[PDB]
Amino acid sequence: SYVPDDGLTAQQLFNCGDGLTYNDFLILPGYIDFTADQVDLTSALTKKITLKTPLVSSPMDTVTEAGMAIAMALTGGIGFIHHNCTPEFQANEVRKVKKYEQGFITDPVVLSPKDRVRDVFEAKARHGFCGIPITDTGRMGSRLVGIISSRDIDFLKEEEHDCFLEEIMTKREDLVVAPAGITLKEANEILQRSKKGKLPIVNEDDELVAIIARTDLKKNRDYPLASKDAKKQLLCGAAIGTHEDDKYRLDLLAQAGVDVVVLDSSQGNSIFQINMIKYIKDKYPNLQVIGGNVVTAAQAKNLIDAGVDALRVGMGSGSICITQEVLACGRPQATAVYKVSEYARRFGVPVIADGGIQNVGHIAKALALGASTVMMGSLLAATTEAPGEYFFSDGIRLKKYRGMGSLDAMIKVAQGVSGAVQDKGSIHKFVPYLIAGIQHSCQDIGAKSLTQVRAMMYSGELKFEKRTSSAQVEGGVHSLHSYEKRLF
């Protein structure tokens, strides 16, 4: 244990007073005694809910909706949803992402047998799913009639040809259900040993209260880390404004029951935001909120004493921000995230970071730099899971990308830009590449989880080191005629 102290620790790094970013310092290695799969990677963002993977979409209007949400949260991530337009629209999107995996399915669609097969067809054409239950009334709290899955409909030329449903369904006497007031363990167990595909739940009065399908099981083992809630729905979050109709923006999604909310800002340290936090917490002590935008400890402290439980840091830091050039605020975000994480560890409040991330290296050392989690926004922009479309300019398949404080929003200034980037493909082939990258970097550092990389920086046992202009212009490729950059 001789172990010379060569390098720089964090507080003796950053107290030089220079605007460090990710591209001008680096991390030392350490000792390794395990393999990369033998890491754990579970992070968190608030005092209650934790995440298997420490990365999150940023709620900007042309980067994230339902697709990003269910897809990335399905990979054990978590998505946030913007607040660009009318609240009922966002209520519909948070509604549709609140399902796509549920516990006991309260209030699914259900019909009365005086419908036709074309009715189930047009229900499917705006649902996509057709394992339909059927009751006497068509209402949810009703008496059971039968069950119809996809195996029942796919072979008929008769879509309405006296296609009242009564002569074609299974008769309910050989249809097992569960009694209500039951947990999942024996529920899923008698599903699989019943082995029939769907499992409704009624009471003694044969009143429909719940139903569960196969799809829990293969979504479970196909996404073994998946960011389940207590009722094993997926998690979700959404962004909000500050103009007084924000209360009407939040209450209807509270009826929709989102799991967390991001207070968006240009800059957080206002009376507006602490007063709306106090508007939240008395109204929703059970619901959680994160804070921003804040880049130093003073704004950090007068946001956290208001009782915010998480934190979005880094203004003037994104791919799209130009608020340095026009508004002269913020700081280099790597210098931010150190000192605001060092302040936020005093109160057990985690922090998620933004902006400027090129690659897995930036976020890798960024969460090693003291951030609990990090909200990358551009390096997952323009996927097939993205809002918008592919299009072409100069012969490249391509998708546009704005900044949600541009002049393109709807006597004003502008501090966001609008542009475009290349396609990056399916996220299910992309974010496992990311988590592989983080776990190779932590494997390089040599910790079996991230929490002791943060402690091991707080112990200062690893060191850090400056880079200069020649070091970064070395840092990528150099002295080479022509190459290709293939991430995976």
């Binding site: 579970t42 992070s43 968190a44 608030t46 005092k47 209650k48 934790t50 560890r345 005093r346 057990g348 985690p350 609990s372 929490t451 002791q452 943060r454 402690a455 707080y458 112990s459």
Partner: peptide
């Protein structure tokens, strides 16, 4: 247990 999940144990130590 998120306080453990960030650092754990030391938790400030000025």
């Amino acid at each position: 247990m998120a306080d453990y999940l960030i650092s754990g144990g030391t938790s400030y130590v000025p």
